[PDB]
Chains A and B, each alone.
With several copies, the nearest count.
Chain A
Amino acid sequence: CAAPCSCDGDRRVDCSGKGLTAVPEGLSAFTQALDISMNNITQLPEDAFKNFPFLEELQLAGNDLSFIHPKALSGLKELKVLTLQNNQLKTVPSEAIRGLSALQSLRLDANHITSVPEDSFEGLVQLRHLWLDDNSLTEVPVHPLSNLPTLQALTLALNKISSIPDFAFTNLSSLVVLHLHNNKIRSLSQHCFDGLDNLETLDLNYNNLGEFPQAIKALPSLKELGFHSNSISVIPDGAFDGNPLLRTIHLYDNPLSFVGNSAFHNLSDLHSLVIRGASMVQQFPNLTGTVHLESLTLTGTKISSIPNNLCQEQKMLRTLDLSYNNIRDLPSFNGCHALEEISLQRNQIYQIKEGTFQGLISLRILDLSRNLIHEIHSRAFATLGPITNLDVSFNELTSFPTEGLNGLNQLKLVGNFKLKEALAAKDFVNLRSLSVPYAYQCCAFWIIHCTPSTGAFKPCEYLLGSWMIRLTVWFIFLVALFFNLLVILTTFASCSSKLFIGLISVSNLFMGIYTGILTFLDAVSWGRFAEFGIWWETGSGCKVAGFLAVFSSESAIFLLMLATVERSLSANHLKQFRVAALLAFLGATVAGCFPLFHRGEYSASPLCLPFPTGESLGFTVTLVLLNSLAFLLMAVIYTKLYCNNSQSSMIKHVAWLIFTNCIFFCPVAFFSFAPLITAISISPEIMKSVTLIFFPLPACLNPVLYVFFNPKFKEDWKLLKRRVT
């Protein structure tokens, strides 16, 4: 070897990383490839390559070169590859690059070239590859380009060319590749591509063309065409007429609106077709001749019918997306053997016939969501064995067959409301992902990881829960009902605060019935709260229960609010008091009946609680707020009398009742405002237990306060009871 740079190889000297200028002196005179790229050479002096007469490849990329002497490239008669990218010039080298008749590849990209002298490219009789991209050219150098009949590749991308004049490339009979993308081309003349008979690739992406080019009817050898990311909106009828060998067409990212019926026909080499956004298309395109398609995509159009002759000639077809159309009849699919993916979402399909889905061995993904399908026969599913995804959602289904779908891996059936039946768990063994219409469904339905994800709010086995709670609620029904019985009999039998005592007695009766309904409901369905859930939560039971709870809870509180005022007023008006009691029952009835008309309520827990999970922050939130608003005034008046015989007993009886009510009403409210304070997470079933335990708790304890603990008028009635005895 010789000199101090790398120099390693067979006649191949590589001094790229480190150097300055003048090229390495002292090198062998038989060097055939010099790579001095990425250095600080800014100018080539005259006769700067006189020690390398046999050099064939020269690389000068990455330098700061800005001046080439006309006689610098003298004696390089064997040079074949010259790279000059990433350097700086304002003219095509020109003069210096005239004695390079053996030159074949020339790179002039990434420079600041903005003018092409008319005398350039005169002397290069063997040029094959030319790079002219990443520059500031504003027009096609037609005249200089008419000196290279042997040119094979040409790139003019990333420039500022506005239009192509007539007969621009009328002398390149060997060009195979042409790139014109990332320019500002917006107009093309009629006679602009004449003489390009050997051209195979055309790129016109990222331009501002306004109308489909009619000049493409001159390239019979054209195979790949791309014109995506343009402003083409209308494709004329009969466009690709002179290009029978087309195999790839890119036309996406365009505001297409209309496509001619007889436009894609008679294209036997095309393998894919993706059209999206053709709003003003209402007929299926003609495809008599294009029988080699492997992916067909037609979405966003007004196509309402399909010609079933389609799944005939298209022998091979792998994906099909006909979404976002007005299709209502599913024309048979027998014949598309190679078809694998079908997308038919967002259409007007209403039925599914026996023969709709057959000849589908290789199906694997099916999508039928949002079609308003309501009738599905027991057929058109056996013929499709290897099917994994079955998306039928937001439809109007009433009965889902389970035959031939044992091989599914992901099922989506969420959105249907008329499907209240229970799906068989033995027919979806291989199923891994499930979504169902309801929770009971989930319930019922519930590594599967179902979407509803039932919790304590939706139990699958025990309504009430632990046997303890079960033994606790049986005792309340047996006590309250019977206890709240004789009390009213006395008052009812024999026509002050004594009234609100009977009035409070009545308020309890309704609450007990609610609990009894809940308990009876718990005893009928034991260890089987799966098929009794949907019927219970999407039907009349829940409403009645929610008015006997709301009517009874709210009524008691409201009723409990009038007795305190009565004592306060005693320590004439008798007439008014009756009228006041009749108005509370009516409100309680309204307050109770108000939620029976709006949507989403009495549908959060199987107990039909007023505020379960608080998922109505209206009445439920207002009810809790009103419960306390009302609770506040009673406590205020109590502290007020506190500030300063029978009356004492009544008073004592009433205080025991409110204290007891106030003491017993604290957890219900406390559980209502969980998200604000997070309450250290949510009671898994404790809330239910608490809610279950505490919400009807006053309905028994309260009435016992004056029963014998405070025998005032109640003791008079007990003595009256002994009298009846």
Chain B
Amino acid sequence: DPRRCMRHHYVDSISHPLYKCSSKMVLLARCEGHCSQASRSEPLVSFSTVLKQPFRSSCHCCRPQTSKLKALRLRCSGGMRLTATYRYILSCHCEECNS
């Protein structure tokens, strides 16, 4: 089913804002799709004078599970070997937004 919560791939080109930093293209993965559990927002009935969070809500979002941090080094036309980092998703699923 092409409409389930899946892990996709794409490319981005990385270059430091400052510095005649040299260029480099790398491969990235994101999460995209629809989850089967619907959302709801049911009200809470309270007797206390001071009210509180008026609604008890629930919502599932396709969110990452496993990430491996990576480091990538470029040349910015200078002595400094600037290193950039990101998180490599290795798996994605549904979880409560306000878990």
Direct contact of A and B (CB under 8 A): yes
Measured CB to CB, the residues of A under 8 A from B are 9-10, 12, 33, 81, 104-105, 107, 129, 131, 152-153, 155, 157, 177, 179, 181-182, 201, 203, 205-206, 226, 228-229, 252-253
A104 engages B9 (CB within 8 Å)? yes
In angstroms, Cα B91 to Cα A81, docked, is 15
Q: Shortest distance in angstroms between B6's beta carbon and chain A's nearest beta carbon?
A: 12
Q: Does B37 contact A (CB under 8 A)?
A: no
In angstroms, Cα B13 to Cα A129, docked, is 13
Binds A, one of B17-25, B43-51, B54-62, B79-87: B17-25
Cβ-defined partner of A205 (8 Å) among B23, B25, B65, B90: B23
Cβ-defined partner of A12 (8 Å) among B20, B27, B91: B91
Cβ-defined partner of B22 (8 Å) among A33, A152, A153, A181: A181
A206 engages B91 (CB within 8 Å)? no
A253 engages B20 (CB within 8 Å)? yes
Q: Shortest distance in angstroms between A213's beta carbon and chain B's nearest beta carbon?
A: 18
Residues of B within 8 A of A9 (CB): 66, 90-91
Residues of A within 8 A of B65 (CB): 10
Residues of B within 8 A of A203 (CB): 13, 23
A177 engages B91 (CB within 8 Å)? no
Q: Do A177 and B23 form a contact, CB below 8 Å, given A9-B66, A105-B9? A: no
B11 engages A153 (CB within 8 Å)? yes
Residues of A within 8 A of B13 (CB): 177, 179, 201, 203
In angstroms, Cα B22 to Cα A152, docked, is 21
Residues of A within 8 A of B25 (CB): 131, 153, 155, 177, 179
In angstroms, Cα B25 to Cα A336, docked, is 38
> Can you pick out 27 interface pairs between chain A and chain B where the beta carbons lie within 8 Å of each other?
A9-B66, A9-B91, A10-B65, A10-B91, A12-B66, A12-B90, A81-B9, A81-B27, A105-B9, A129-B9, A129-B11, A129-B27, A131-B25, A153-B11, A153-B25, A157-B22, A157-B23, A177-B11, A177-B13, A179-B13, A181-B23, A182-B22, A201-B13, A203-B13, A205-B22, A226-B23, A229-B20
In angstroms, Cα B20 to Cα A537, docked, is 50
Residues of B within 8 A of A201 (CB): 13
In angstroms, Cα B90 to Cα A131, docked, is 21
In angstroms, Cα B5 to Cα A10, docked, is 15
Q: Shortest distance in angstroms between A253's beta carbon and chain B's nearest beta carbon?
A: 7
Question: Closest chain B residue to A129 by CB distance?
Answer: B11
Question: Closest chain B residue to A252 by CB distance?
Answer: B20
Q: Do A179 and B23 form a contact, CB below 8 Å, given A9-B66, A10-B91, A105-B9? A: yes
Residues of B within 8 A of A179 (CB): 13, 23, 25
Q: Shortest distance in angstroms between A189's beta carbon and chain B's nearest beta carbon?
A: 24
Interface size on B, residues (CB 8 A): 12
Q: Shortest distance in angstroms between B18's beta carbon and chain A's nearest beta carbon?
A: 13
In angstroms, Cα B25 to Cα A555, docked, is 83
Within 8 A of A (CB), among B55-99: 65-66, 90-91
In angstroms, Cα B15 to Cα A181, docked, is 13
In angstroms, Cα B77 to Cα A229, docked, is 11
In angstroms, Cα B11 to Cα A131, docked, is 11
In angstroms, Cα B91 to Cα A78, docked, is 17
Residues of B within 8 A of A252 (CB): 20
Q: Shortest distance in angstroms between B71's beta carbon and chain A's nearest beta carbon?
A: 14
A9-B90, A203-B13 given; name 12 further pairs at CB < 8 Å.
A9-B66, A33-B90, A81-B9, A107-B27, A129-B9, A129-B27, A157-B22, A157-B23, A181-B22, A182-B22, A205-B23, A228-B20
Q: Shortest distance in angstroms between A182's beta carbon and chain B's nearest beta carbon?
A: 6
Residues of B within 8 A of A226 (CB): 23
Q: Shortest distance in angstroms between A229's beta carbon and chain B's nearest beta carbon?
A: 8
In angstroms, Cα B65 to Cα A570, docked, is 115
In angstroms, Cα B9 to Cα A391, docked, is 52
Residues of A within 8 A of B66 (CB): 9-10, 12
Q: Shortest distance in angstroms between B64's beta carbon and chain A's nearest beta carbon?
A: 12
In angstroms, Cα B13 to Cα A197, docked, is 20
In angstroms, Cα B11 to Cα A9, docked, is 25
Q: Shortest distance in angstroms between A319's beta carbon and chain B's nearest beta carbon?
A: 15
Q: Do A105 and B27 form a contact, CB below 8 Å, given A10-B91, A153-B11, A177-B13? A: yes
Residues of A within 8 A of B9 (CB): 81, 104-105, 129
Residues of B within 8 A of A153 (CB): 11, 25
In angstroms, Cα B78 to Cα A253, docked, is 13
| Top 8 A-B pairs, shortest CB-CB distance | A153-B11, A10-B91, A155-B25, A129-B11, A203-B23, A105-B27, A181-B23, A179-B25
Residues of A within 8 A of B90 (CB): 9, 12, 33
Q: Shortest distance in angstroms between A111's beta carbon and chain B's nearest beta carbon?
A: 16
In angstroms, Cα B12 to Cα A177, docked, is 9
Residues of B within 8 A of A33 (CB): 90
In angstroms, Cα B27 to Cα A16, docked, is 19
Q: What does the 1/0 interface line of B7-44 toward A look like (CB < 8 Å)?
A: 00101010000001011010100000000000000000
Q: Do A206 and B22 form a contact, CB below 8 Å, given A9-B66, A12-B91? A: yes
Residues of B within 8 A of A81 (CB): 9, 27
In angstroms, Cα B23 to Cα A152, docked, is 18
In angstroms, Cα B9 to Cα A413, docked, is 58
